[PDB]
Ligand binder design. Structure first.
Ligand SMILES: Nc1nc2c(ncn2[C@@H]2O[C@H](COP(=O)(O)OP(=O)(O)OP(=O)(O)O)[C@@H](O)[C@H]2O)c(=O)[nH]1
Ligand SMILES: Nc1ncnc2c1ncn2[C@@H]1O[C@H](COP(=O)(O)OP(=O)(O)CP(=O)(O)O)[C@@H](O)[C@H]1O
Ligand SMILES: Nc1nc2c(ncn2[C@@H]2O[C@H](COP(=O)(O)OP(=O)(O)O)[C@@H](O)[C@H]2O)c(=O)[nH]1
Ligand SMILES: COc1cc([C@@H]2CC(c3ccccc3)=NN2C(N)=S)cc(OC)c1OC
Ligand SMILES: [Ca+2]
Ligand SMILES: [Ca+2]
Ligand SMILES: [Ca+2]
Ligand SMILES: [Mg+2]
Ligand SMILES: [Mg+2]
Ligand SMILES: [Mg+2]
Lengths: 54, 438, 425, 352
């Protein structure tokens, strides 16, 4: 079990102990996504308003 | 010195940010009005605390933080609160109406109208940075804002700051304190859209924090205030190494390289000890061995699960208080012989240790006692995939009947995003099973 | 999501609506003057959801009063809180509607509806964030059912992205005014299935039975029924009017209660049942009673169906650990009656302020498939007449075709099939 | 009123446990997929332990121990015995065994197996081994026959020293194994059922012909299948403990307790205390119990050897009623109380 890369300083210390060794979409693709969903919303709203007009 | 910006989204994120920044100020001796007698460099700074605070000519120390909610009531209590003076008004951003617990409403419908404003305020903060490391993003899985707006924020952050690291602190949904029946939907949705945009995420399961609060603080019915003061202690021990002199995890890149060998499996389990009631009349202080040993009981984890039946890819121990390396190695030696700690074959069995000598700070009048030493262990164990299985089951149960999906479709989402997200989660569960089981 | 616009239409709409404003005005500490004289500030923290603030720090109910007959609304103005209502919000014709859905929806009502919508628009234009509308009405008369559903579609046209919530009193032969009530109700349920997000189904059969069997009143008045109705209404709107760990609004209520859009007809429950009581009730007693069929305001046996979702509110000072424990116990002990494919479908809230007259109380909002029992009852009464086209002339004289009737019956029978679908899923 | 769910319907034992549970009048059964249970009679494979213990207000309990397959599948049993200091290679109640994977799967111990096989050739000791997989058995003095066999199948097998001088009951000159039923409760109390069974063979043991199965393989099925005299001496090829005790007294001047049972209690406790830290549910959010079936051989010196551990055992049919009642007494109502124990508790605290 060996201790390594030990570093000390006034506020603390760090080290490593080893027990055993080993054996993105664009801005405009995003705006296209948001805009497609807005379109689908507006279409649903229009289908509703058409039925109410009937 | 390289700056980090903290971003708190929705109710859970904002209230936890409150908790953390109260704690940070206590720890760095910054007063509510923003002053720091302790800082002798007036108006300026190259120090480790300047990673989280900027300075003004009047000596005010200001969080590198943005609060974002789609509805005002919660950020309003920041604006009127005890830390009123600390935050610049442009750092607190509110909408008119929230996302109604609806991922697609927060992502698509209301996200679209506020994303550019939020990115502009975030860049106002980034322009004040000589060398920005990246972001700490706080949010709930279950909220509509929390899930949906955060995922849109994460995509845009990858676009505007692609070299930066993004870390998450995510609240995982628990029915004892949850507010909505669709939180599984939201969490899968947001995990799926956020996965390749997060470098490392610490999940906190409200169930685990709740039971810690009942069992070890003797609180009959924990509030968000209880939960958040405890969660903020944990977050503080995770960030202390960015805010203090040291040599372990000194920048956000080090969290990924120490805790995340595989980029998809980037959800380290956090275990924290000791949690002791302030109203405990007589308490015998616990030793290095006792609290390192507590690191391996599930009852102390931020997520209930059983690492005995998984494999480790990485383990870090952050101690705060009266701790020296010799005692840590002694305790580790003895724990290894008494416990099932199996690392994956292609990783060294071992621990990275960091010690800071000031013991945890506790808010006056809080529920937590002051203690002489404490430890937060961060271990990337495959056992955490249990939580995904939980979530996924709940999701499968509802989505089979398409229950509630109509509320999302009516926001412009397509039913197909549900099964895309679920299939990504299926992938994820399979990756964990490959790495961690024979 | 702050301001709600309340509309009461017709005799029943306005009488329950007035009792509602009485009850919650008392709970919030406002007197008939419109002046606040309370002792806690939980009272004023969200009082903008239901009240506007006038000059002199007066509070004015965001409430519109609608009838085709002047009678009941002059009695409203006569009554206890009559002068708290803004006088421009009284909108009324002279004809009356003769218990005739057609008169309310197609002929007399058309004539009056644009005025009401003018007042509605005036009230919503002053709202920072309007969440939507709650309507009080019965379904068995003519103004409430016919004209109220006319209003509902006009409002959906002008405010298609706001929430429409109704308290809808269903007719019972046990309390009935006329024989055509099943006709009026079936036409209205056709409207409500299409055009509301959340309907509290207040069944006059259940109110009569509670008044008779449980409260031991042998000849119940509308006053006795409306006592129960204003108790229920105060309960179900608690988490909208007060701040808590859970602060609700009309849309989150729809999101968490309604898994499928048409299945939005809620069965309310109340405990303790009270009539115009010194022993305090224990949390186990509240929890047992509120779930008892004898405390349901919709005459349905909840063991004949399954709970899709449940939301309970406990009012008073008591141990929320005990309430959590009790709710969890009733779920885990009768778990067959809660669908397995909606996890954690029971959510519980507490508020410290109790209703006037009680130290402790509990209100229950159930989305049960047992609600189908109500719609089949109406459906039976409908067919019994319609198969002989009886009384149809009152309606065909106002322009309606039989086709509209058979269409509405069909849609309601479909609603019932949907409920049975999910009761065996 | 406690609640429970049944997810293994081919369990003889837990079928009867289901029945007496209802007969209490204080237990109600739920549907397979209902999460609001106190008690799970789980399935044999891929039991979802990750979903247990997350129901507020439900103490949850399951009839299996996550991890216990380390003991109950032969390759893992071999691995566990020779890798754990508590047991070690020098473990004296386990036959030397080695794990061997097939040709086209390729870790494995093939070469170290023959390392000993050759000093067994040379040794002039019995060099007959058995090959096993977790149907599919071969007993041979020739190693290469063993591995020929092994790799024309696709499974990982284990090669284990066959016990060439077993104890043979007379009349018959015939083999047997002993099966012991062990219940481990949520407290990791280890309970041995007072009644075991000898699964006998009806055929005289014959050393020369190692490829007629029935005089060499003791399990119930093969005796009810390929054996000429099934049921001849004992009903069901099953000798219980009263008899075997009397026989040992009459023929060997010993008792079952002294000659065999001390060794059996020792092996059961060593095996379970070994894996206890890996499987204990002492501070977990759910609880386990489990019923195991331990199988032992007795050689002519009256030494006990462990051959296998069974994670989902059936009972002998006369004992079903008694054992199952005890399961409810000790495993289930200890956790969920209702309105002369048949078990020996296995414990020993020698000081040193
Ligand atoms: N630990 C903790 N969990 C919280 C807190 N606030 C909310 N939650 C949990 O987060 C989930 C609800 O999400 P919220 O963050 O409140 O929702 P939001 O992001 O504000 O989205 P909307 O208000 O729907 O627009 C539930 O699981 C809550 O229990 C908090 O302050 N601390
Ligand atoms: N080393 C060995 N020496 C002698 N006989 C052995 C032996 N290993 C196994 N046997 C014999 O093989 C028989 C069955 O072997 P084994 O117990 O491994 O298979 P199995 O898993 O089908 C039993 P069960 O069905 O009860 O689980 C035993 O009863 C025993 O007679
Ligand atoms: N619970 C209750 N039901 C009423 C009341 N008044 C009328 N109803 C019912 O409402 C139906 C008649 O409708 P009503 O409101 O008088 O008709 P409208 O004025 O023309 O809309 C009948 O089923 C009555 O039973 C009341 O005050 N309380
Ligand atoms: C907690 O009980 C209440 C719950 C609400 C909606 C319903 C919902 C809910 C959550 C989970 C399961 C089932 C329902 N939670 N809800 C919201 N968070 S808005 C509304 C309430 O009143 C309007 C209310 O009290 C009566
Ligand atoms: Ca400085
Ligand atoms: Ca990236
Ligand atoms: Ca006219
Ligand atoms: Mg919110
Ligand atoms: Mg009338
Ligand atoms: Mg006009």
């Amino acid at each position: 079990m060996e201790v390594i890369e030990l570093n000390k300083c006034t506020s603390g210390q760090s080290f490593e102990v080893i027990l055993k060794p080993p054996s993105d979409p664009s801005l405009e693709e995003i705006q296209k996504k948001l805009e497609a969903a807005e379109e689908r919303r507006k279409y649903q709203e229009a289908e509703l308003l058409k039925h109410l007009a009937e | 010195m390289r700056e980090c910006i903290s971003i708190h989204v929705g109710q859970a994120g904002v209230q936890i940010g409150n908790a953390c920044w109260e704690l940070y100020c206590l720890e760095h001796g910054i007063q509510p009005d923003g002053q720091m007698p302790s800082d002798k460099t007036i108006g300026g700074g190259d120090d480790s605390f300047n990673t989280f605070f900027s300075e003004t000519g009047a000596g005010k120390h200001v969080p590198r933080a943005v609060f974002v909610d789609l509805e005002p009531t919660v950020i309003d209590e920041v604006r009127t609160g005890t830390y009123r003076q600390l935050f610049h008004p442009e750092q607190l951003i509110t909408g008119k109406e929230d996302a109604a617990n609806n991922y697609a409403r927060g992502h698509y419908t209301i996200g679209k109208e506020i994303i550019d404003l939020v990115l502009d305020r975030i860049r106002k903060l980034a322009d004040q940075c000589t060398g920005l490391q990246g972001f700490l993003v706080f949010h709930s899985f279950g909220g509509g804002t929390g899930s949906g707006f955060t995922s849109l924020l994460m995509e845009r952050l990858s676009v505007d700051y692609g070299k930066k690291s993004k870390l998450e602190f995510s609240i995982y949904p628990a029915p004892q304190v949850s507010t909505a029946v669709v939180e599984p939907y939201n969490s899968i949705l947001t995990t799926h859209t956020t996965l390749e945009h997060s470098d490392c995420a610490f999940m906190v399961d409200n169930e685990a924090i709740y039971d810690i609060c009942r069992r070890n603080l003797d609180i009959e019915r924990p509030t968000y205030t209880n939960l958040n003061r405890l969660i903020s202690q944990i977050v503080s021990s995770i960030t202390a190494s960015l805010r203090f002199d040291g040599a372990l995890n000194v920048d956000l890149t080090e969290f990924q390289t120490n805790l995340v060998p595989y980029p998809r499996i980037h959800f380290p389990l956090a275990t924290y000890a000791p949690v002791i009631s302030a109203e405990k009349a007589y308490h015998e202080q616990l030793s290095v061995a006792e609290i390192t040993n507590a690191c391996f009981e599930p009852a102390n984890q931020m997520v209930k699960c059983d690492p005995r039946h998984g494999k480790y890819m990485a383990c870090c121990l952050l101690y705060r208080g009266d701790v020296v390396p010799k005692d840590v190695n002694a305790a580790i030696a003895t724990i290894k012989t008494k416990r099932s700690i199996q690392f994956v074959d292609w990783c060294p069995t071992g621990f990275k240790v960091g010690i800071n000598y000031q013991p945890p700070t506790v808010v006056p009048g809080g529920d937590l006692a002051k203690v002489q030493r404490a430890v937060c262990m961060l271990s990337n164990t495959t056992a955490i995939a249990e939580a995904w299985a939980r979530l996924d089951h709940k999701f499968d149960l509802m989505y089979a009947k398409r229950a509630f999906v109509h509320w999302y479709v009516g926001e412009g989402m397509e039913e197909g995003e549900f099964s895309e997200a679920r299939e990504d989660m299926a992938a994820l569960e399979k990756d964990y099973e490959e790495v961690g089981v024979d | 999501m702050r301001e709600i616009v309340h509309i009461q239409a017709g005799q029943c709409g306005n009488q329950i609506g007035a009792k509602f404003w009485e009850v919650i005005s008392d709970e919030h500490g406002i007197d008939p003057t419109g002046s606040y004289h309370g002792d806690s500030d939980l009272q004023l923290e969200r009082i903008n959801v239901y009240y506007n603030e006038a000059t002199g720090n007066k509070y004015v109910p965001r409430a519109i009063l609608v009838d085709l007959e002047p009678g009941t609304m002059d009695s409203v103005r006569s009554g206890p809180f009559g002068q708290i209502f803004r006088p421009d919000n009284f909108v009324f014709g002279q004809s009356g509607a003769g218990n005739n859905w057609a008169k309310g929806h197609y002929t007399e009502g058309a004539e009056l509806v644009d005025s009401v919508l003018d007042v509605v628009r005036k009230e919503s234009e002053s709202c920072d964030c309007l969440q939507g509308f709650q309507l009080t009405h019965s379904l068995g008369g003519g103004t409430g059912s016919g004209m109220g559903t006319l209003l509902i579609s006009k409002i959906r046209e002008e405010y298609p992205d706001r929430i429409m919530n109704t308290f809808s009193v269903m007719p019972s032969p046990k309390v009935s005014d006329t024989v055509v009530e099943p006709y009026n109700a079936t036409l209205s349920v056709h409207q409500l299935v299409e055009n509301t997000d959340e309907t509290y189904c207040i069944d006059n059969e259940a109110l009569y039975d509670i008044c008779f069997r449980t409260l031991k009143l042998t000849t119940p008045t509308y006053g006795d029924l409306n006592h129960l109705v204003s108790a229920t209404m105060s309960g179900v709107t608690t988490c909208l009017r007060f701040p808590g760990q859970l602060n609700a609004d009309l849309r989150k209520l729809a999101v968490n209660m309604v898994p499928f859009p048409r299945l939005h007809f809620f069965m309310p429950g109340f405990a303790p049942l009270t009539s115009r009581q010194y022993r305090a009730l224990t949390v186990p007693e509240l929890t047992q009673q509120m779930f008892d069929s004898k405390n349901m305001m919709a005459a349905c046996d909840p063991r004949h169906g399954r709970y899709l979702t449940v939301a309970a509110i406990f009012r008073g000072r008591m141990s929320m650990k005990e309430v959590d424990e009790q709710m969890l116990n009733v779920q885990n002990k009768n778990s067959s009656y809660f669908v397995e494919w909606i996890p954690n479908n029971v959510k519980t809230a507490v508020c410290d302020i109790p209703p006037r007259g009680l130290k402790m109380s509990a209100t229950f909002i159930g989305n049960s498939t047992a609600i189908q029992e109500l719609f089949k009852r109406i459906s039976e009464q409908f067919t019994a007449m319609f198969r002989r086209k009886a009384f149809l002339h009152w309606y065909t004289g106002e322009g309606m075709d039989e086709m509209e009737f058979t269409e509405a019956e069909s849609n309601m029978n479909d609603l019932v099939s949907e409920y049975q679908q999910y009761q065996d899923a | 009123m406690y609640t429970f769910v049944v997810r293994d319907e081919n369990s003889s034992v837990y079928a009867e446990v289901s029945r007496l549970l209802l007969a209490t009048g204080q237990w109600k059964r739920l549907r397979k997929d209902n999460p609001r249970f106190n008690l799970m009679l789980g399935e044999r494979n891929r039991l979802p332990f990750g979903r247990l213990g997350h129901e507020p207000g439900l103490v949850q309990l399951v009839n299996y121990y996550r991890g216990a397959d380390k003991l109950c599948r032969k390759a893992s049993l071999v691995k566990l015995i020779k890798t754990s200091p508590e047991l070690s290679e020098s473990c004296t109640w386990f036959p030397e065994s080695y794990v061997i994977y097939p040709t086209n799967l390729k870790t494995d111990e093939r070469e170290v197996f023959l390392a000993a096989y050759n000093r067994r050739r040379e040794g002039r000791e019995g060099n007959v081994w058995i090959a096993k997989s977790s149907e599919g058995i071969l007993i041979s003095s020739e190693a290469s026959e063993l591995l020929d066999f092994i790799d024309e199948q696709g499974q990982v097998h284990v090669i284990q020293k066959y016990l060439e001088k077993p104890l043979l009951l007379e009349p018959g000159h015939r083999k047997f194994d002993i099966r012991s039923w062990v219940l481990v409760d949520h407290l990791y109390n280890i309970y041995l059922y007072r009644e075991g069974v000898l699964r006998t063979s009806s055929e005289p043991y014959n050393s020369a012909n190692f490829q007629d199965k029935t005089c060499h393989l003791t399990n119930h099925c093969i005796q009810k299948e390929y054996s000429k005299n099934y049921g001849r001496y004992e009903e069901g090829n099953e000798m219980f403990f009263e008899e075997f005790n009397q026989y040992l007294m009459d023929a060997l001047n010993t008792t079952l307790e002294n000659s065999i049972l001390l060794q059996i209690k020792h092996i059961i406790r060593s095996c379970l205390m070994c894996i206890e830290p890996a499987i204990s549910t002492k501070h977990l959010h759910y609880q386990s119990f489990q019923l195991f079936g331990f199988d032992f051989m007795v050689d002519e010196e009256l030494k006990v050897w462990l051959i296998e551990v069974n994670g989902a055992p059936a009972c002998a049919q006369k004992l079903y009623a008694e054992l199952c009642q005890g399961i409810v007494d000790v495993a289930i109502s200890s956790v969920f109380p209702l309105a002369t124990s048949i078990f020996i508790k296995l414990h020993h605290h020698h000081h040193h």
